[PDB]
Paper text:
In contrast, DEAD box protein 41 (DDX41), a member of the helicase superfamily 2 (SF2), is unique in that it can recognize two different types of ligands, double-stranded DNA (dsDNA) and CDN45. DDX41 consists of two RecA-like domains (i.e., DEAD and HELICc domains), which are conserved among DEAD box proteins. These domains have several conserved motifs, such as the Q motif and motif I, which are both essential for ATP binding by the DEAD box proteins. In this work, we determined two different crystal structures of the DDX41 DEAD domain in apo forms.
We determined the apo-form structures of two constructs, residues 169–402 (DEAD402) and 169–399 (DEAD399), at 1.5 and 2.2 Å resolutions, respectively. In contrast to DEAD402, the crystal structure of DEAD399 contains four molecules in the asymmetric unit, and their N-terminal regions adopt two different conformations. In one conformation, the Q motif is located away from α3 and motif I. Helix α2 is rearranged to form two β strands (β1′ and β2′), and residues 169–183 are disordered. We hereafter refer to this conformation of the N-terminal region as the “open form 1”. We hereafter refer to this conformation of the N-terminal region as the “open form 2”. In these models, the Q motif, including Ile201 and Gln208, is distant from the modeled ATP in the open form 1, while it is disordered in the open form 2. Consequently, the structure of the ATP-binding site is completely rearranged in these open forms, and thus they do not seem to be able to bind ATP. Therefore, these results suggested that the closed form represents the ATP-bound state of DDX41, while both open forms 1 and 2 represent its nucleotide-free state.
Numbering used by the authors: 184 to 399
């Protein structure tokens, strides 16, 4: 409730005609920080980044200000994608905003990519040094979790992007497996282009008392 976006965001949102936005609401529309799980039907890139990515980045920045003496590897937030290409571009966007918000007087948030087809070079440089946000595909993530190579203990925010596509592609078992590695409570956002029965049921499994934003 006391959270504010810094001036680069507030400036750029104002150019678009968005006045008085906060990390908990965008012109009265809730984000993932307002205490509810969410189902987001037919969102574009830009809508997803207002309701999920920017508000979670702010959460990361606030947590960084008073850390415990003995630190934990994050991430604080996780985005699960259907594909390598989509994970990489989603990961490039997060890095873009992470760079934008450092230059508003701070140190740099680090985003991990967790997908197949990463060289060992790419695998080391992402995971070791710090991880605040992670972007992954379901198979690779599951395998990292089971091999105890990644931890979800402080991960509060989860987005499932294109869950319809993920389920179509046969990743549902893999996502449920990932659900079982959350020890604490998560706030979960589900994105989908459409909402047939198949996904309605997966959402019942995956979410608790969700708010629904449907722009189809």
């Amino acid at each position: 409730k006391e959270m504010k976006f810094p001036a680069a965001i507030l400036r750029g949102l104002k150019k678009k005609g968005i006045h008085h936005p906060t990390p908990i609401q965008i012109q009265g529309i809730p984000t993932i920080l307002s205490g509810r799980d969410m189902i987001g039907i037919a969102f574009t890139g830009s809508g997803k980044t207002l309701v999920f990515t920017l508000p979670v980045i702010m959460f990361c920045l606030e947590q960084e200000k008073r850390l415990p003496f003995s630190k934990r590897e994050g991430p604080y937030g996780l985005i699960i994608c259907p594909s390598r290409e989509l994970a990489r571009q989603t990961h490039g966007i997060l890095e873009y905003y992470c760079r934008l918000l450092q230059e508003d007087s701070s140190p740099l948030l680090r985003c991990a990519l967790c997908i197949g087809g990463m060289s060992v070079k790419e695998q080391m440089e992402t995971i070791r040094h710090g991880v605040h946000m992670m972007v992954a595909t379901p198979g690779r993530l599951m395998d990292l979790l089971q091999k105890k190579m990644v931890s979800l203990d402080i991960c509060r925010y989860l987005a499932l992007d294109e869950a319809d596509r993920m389920i179509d592609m046969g990743f549902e078992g893999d996502i449920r497996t990932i659900f079982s590695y959350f020890k604490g409570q998560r706030q979960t956002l589900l994105f989908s282009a459409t909402m047939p029965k198949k996904i309605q049921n997966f959402a019942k499994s995956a979410l608790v008392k969700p708010v629904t934003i449907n722009v189809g």
